[PDB]
Amino acid sequence: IEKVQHIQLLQKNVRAQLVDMKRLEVDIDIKIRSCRGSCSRALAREVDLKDYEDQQKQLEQVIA
Amino acid sequence: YEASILTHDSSIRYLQEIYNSNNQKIVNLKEKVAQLAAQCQEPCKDTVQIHDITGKDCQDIANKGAKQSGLYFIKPLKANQQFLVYCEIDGSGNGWTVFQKRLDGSVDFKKNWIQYKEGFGHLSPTGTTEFWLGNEKIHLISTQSAIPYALRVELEDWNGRTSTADYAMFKVGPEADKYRLTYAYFAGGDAGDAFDGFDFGDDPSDKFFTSHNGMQFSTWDNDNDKFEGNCAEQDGSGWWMNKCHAGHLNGVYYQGGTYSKASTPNGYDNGIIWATWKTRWYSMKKTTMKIIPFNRLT
Amino acid sequence: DETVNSNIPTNLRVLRSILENLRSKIQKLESDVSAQMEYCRTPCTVSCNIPVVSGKECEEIIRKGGETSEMYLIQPDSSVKPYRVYCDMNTENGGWTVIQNRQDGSVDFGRKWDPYKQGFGNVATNTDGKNYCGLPGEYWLGNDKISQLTRMGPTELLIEMEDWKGDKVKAHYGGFTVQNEANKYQISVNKYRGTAGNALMDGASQLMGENRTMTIHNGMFFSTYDRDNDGWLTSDPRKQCSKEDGGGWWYNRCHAANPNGRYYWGGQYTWDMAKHGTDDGVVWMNWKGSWYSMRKMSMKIRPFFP
Numbered sequence: 001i002e003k004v005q006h007i008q009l010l011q012k013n014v015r016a017q018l019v020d021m022k023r024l025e026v027d028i029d030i031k032i033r034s035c036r037g038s039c040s041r042a043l044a045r046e047v048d049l050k051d052y053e054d055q056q057k058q059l060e061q062v063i064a
Numbered sequence: 065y066e067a068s069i070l071t072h073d074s075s076i077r078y079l080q081e082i083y084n085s086n087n088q089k090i091v092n093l094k095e096k097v098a099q100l101a102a103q104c105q106e107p108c109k110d111t112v113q114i115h116d117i118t119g120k121d122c123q124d125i126a127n128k129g130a131k132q133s134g135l136y137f138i139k140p141l142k143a144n145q146q147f148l149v150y151c152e153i154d155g156s157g158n159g160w161t162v163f164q165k166r167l168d169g170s171v172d173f174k175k176n177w178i179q180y181k182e183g184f185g186h187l188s189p190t191g192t193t194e195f196w197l198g199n200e201k202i203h204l205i206s207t208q209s210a211i212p213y214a215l216r217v218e219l220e221d222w223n224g225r226t227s228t229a230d231y232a233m234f235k236v237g238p239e240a241d242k243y244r245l246t247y248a249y250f251a252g253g254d255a256g257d258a259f260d261g262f263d264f265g266d267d268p269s270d271k272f273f274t275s276h277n278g279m280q281f282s283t284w285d286n287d288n289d290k291f292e293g294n295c296a297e298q299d300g301s302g303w304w305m306n307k308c309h310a311g312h313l314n315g316v317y318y319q320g321g322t323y324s325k326a327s328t329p330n331g332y333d334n335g336i337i338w339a340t341w342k343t344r345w346y347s348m349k350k351t352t353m354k355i356i357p358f359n360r361l362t
Numbered sequence: 363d364e365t366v367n368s369n370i371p372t373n374l375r376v377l378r379s380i381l382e383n384l385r386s387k388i389q390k391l392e393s394d395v396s397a398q399m400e401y402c403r404t405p406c407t408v409s410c411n412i413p414v415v416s417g418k419e420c421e422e423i424i425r426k427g428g429e430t431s432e433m434y435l436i437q438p439d440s441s442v443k444p445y446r447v448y449c450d451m452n453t454e455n456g457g458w459t460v461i462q463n464r465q466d467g468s469v470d471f472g473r474k475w476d477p478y479k480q481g482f483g484n485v486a487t488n489t490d491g492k493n494y495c496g497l498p499g500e501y502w503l504g505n506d507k508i509s510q511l512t513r514m515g516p517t518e519l520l521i522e523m524e525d526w527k528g529d530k531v532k533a534h535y536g537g538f539t540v541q542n543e544a545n546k547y548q549i550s551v552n553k554y555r556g557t558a559g560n561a562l563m564d565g566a567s568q569l570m571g572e573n574r575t576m577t578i579h580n581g582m583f584f585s586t587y588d589r590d591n592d593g594w595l596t597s598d599p600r601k602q603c604s605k606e607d608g609g610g611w612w613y614n615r616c617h618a619a620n621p622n623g624r625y626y627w628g629g630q631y632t633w634d635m636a637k638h639g640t641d642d643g644v645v646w647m648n649w650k651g652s653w654y655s656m657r658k659m660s661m662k663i664r665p666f667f668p
């Protein structure tokens with residue numbers, strides 16, 4: 001109908017925000033680690049791209 | 065289990081809310097991330113630094129303002145380039161330029177000609193590191209046009225006792241003359257005039273075999289002593305050897321202080337000894353040789 | 363409308379889970395950045411007492427007795443004041459001046475033209491309770507200084523790298539020079555030998571014809587994300603080789619290797635990880651190929667004695 005057009009937009013949108021968040025995730029990781037050479041210490045952490053990777057495959061298995 | 069299809073319109077808009085809300089939080093986050101990055105561009109702060117004040121020697125510097133000890137760059141008149149040194153300024157405006165230091169044995173003093181010439185070890189603001197400035201540099205500093213210099217040998221045993229021995233007209237020559245040490249006269253000091261020689265009782269000529277004035281520098285790969293053998297290769301160091309010594313501040317750093325012939329396969333007295341203040345079987349705990357214009361030594 | 367109105371409810375709960383998943387991840391991140399901000403209220407510090415032996419560069423220093431790899435002070439020329447540098451005295455006979463070093467991502471390398479000119483990063487750090495700094499930090503010596511060194515006479519270039527499985531290869535260059543700023547730090551190299559793949563002179567292995575030739579770095583100018591001097595001619599402010607946070611390198615169209623790229627942990631990385639979906643990152647295609655960041659990467663020079 002038309003309410004269906006709304007969902008086909010939120011599908012591309014939540015996929016864009018998924019990729020965008022994935023990048024922001026890596027970005028923050030590299031910047032936080034780069035303070036190690038400037039600040040007293042750097043936040044010990046580890047990224048979980050997996051959870052990000054599943055929500056992507058899981059969205060495609062619904063986009064169709 | 066699936067609710068009314070009239071719910072859709074609402075639910076469609078609600079997701080649109082947490083989507084735009086998120087995108088905003090993402091924009092705010094990306095700005096904060098920018099600020100963070102701008103706080104992580106600088107390098108680690110180095111506790112050690114080198115003052116901008118320069119001059120021919122540590123005295124020339126102090127007479128310019130230098131008020132605190134620490135690393136400085138000096139360039140004697142006839143010197144090709146400038147080099148780093150450890151200046152010592154006291155509450156009187158005296159600029160002692162130090163060329164030798166011992167305090168913990170953290171530096172092996174068994175080096176060759178080249179090394180004893182260029183210098184080895186580390187310089188430091190707190191004057192808490194051992195080193196050897198380098199013959200060539202020591203030569204340039206003490207032979208600047210018409211400026212008579214004075215050497216002060218400050219010692220310390222393992223008990224807080226500290227003596228000194230000053231020599232006037234201290235001077236070291238150029239490689240051509242094997243960095244020969246010479247001085248006009250012993251200028252005083254409870255440490256004793258070890259450079260003049262010492263009578264150990266081992267031989268009627270001891271004194272003659274142990275005087276350092278006029279002695280050329282010697283290292284194992286460059287025997288310039290007054291002995292049939294190699295003094296430097298025996299004591300494992302670099303020094304103004306004769307046959308061999310009465311004062312040796314570049315000796316093997318024995319921990320504790322007391323040692324003996326049970327310390328080597330040949331029972332050599334190769335420690336930081338200064339015969340006129342302690343027995344040749346008592347290596348000092350500290351050692352420091354510094355120079356300064358003579359016309360400054362009160 | 364039979365099952366269709368079932369597919370819809372499925373999305374209204376699926377999308378809903380993700381959107382609320384992401385909104386929480388946003389929260390976790392906002393938190394992480396605040397802790398780090400707090401840690402930046404104070405700096406890291408080093409105590410690098412300066413060695414006595416010194417000279418024009420590491421080769422001369424080792425010839426004067428400096429035989430231990432650590433931080434030394436060098437004055438390549440009596441015009442500019444002496445500066446700190448890290449000397450590698452063991453690798454292949456020693457005497458190597460380190461002009462570039464990556465090993466843990468402790469330093470931002472995506473900088474503008476000026477910092478790449480003067481240099482940035484940490485030269486050395488303190489080693490296991492010691493008064494001197496025997497371990498090198500992550501740094502880029504600085505275009506001006508690198509140019510002055512390579513021009514003092516015939517200079518050779520040694521490039522080393524390691525992946526995340528401990529594998530190591532190397533790229534040698536008997537001849538290497540870098541002009542000054544007026545000439546855009548133009549680079550020239552020759553006489554290759556190694557196991558990393560002559561990526562600098564021959565461009566990426568997995569490319570053919572003009573596709574490979576345009577990845578040749580030799581003879582390229584130097585560019586930063588705020589200074590385009592690359593081999594990409596056009597008014598398209600999007601096609602440039604060096605985008606934001608990207609490193610400064612002798613980019614062409616665009617690269618076969620980029621030692622100054624972003625430090626991605628783990629190695630392999632995807633387009634949805636890269637800020638611009640471009641191949642930025644410690645790359646050397648001729649060995650590990652494209653989209654794979656090295657764990658260690660360094661660039662050292664030494665006077666070339668035929």
Ligand SMILES: *[C@@H]1O[C@H](CO)[C@@H](O)[C@H](O)[C@H]1NC(C)=O
Binds near residue numbers: 569570571573574
């Ligand atoms: C060059 O790259 C394009 C895509 O950018 C590709 O289609 C083309 O086949 C490449 N040329 C070669 C070497 O085949």
Ligand SMILES: [Ca+2]
Binds near residue numbers: 287289291292294295
């Ligand atoms: Ca002899």
Ligand SMILES: [Ca+2]
Binds near residue numbers: 101471472473
């Ligand atoms: Ca940056």
Ligand SMILES: [Ca+2]
Binds near residue numbers: 591593595596
């Ligand atoms: Ca361009």
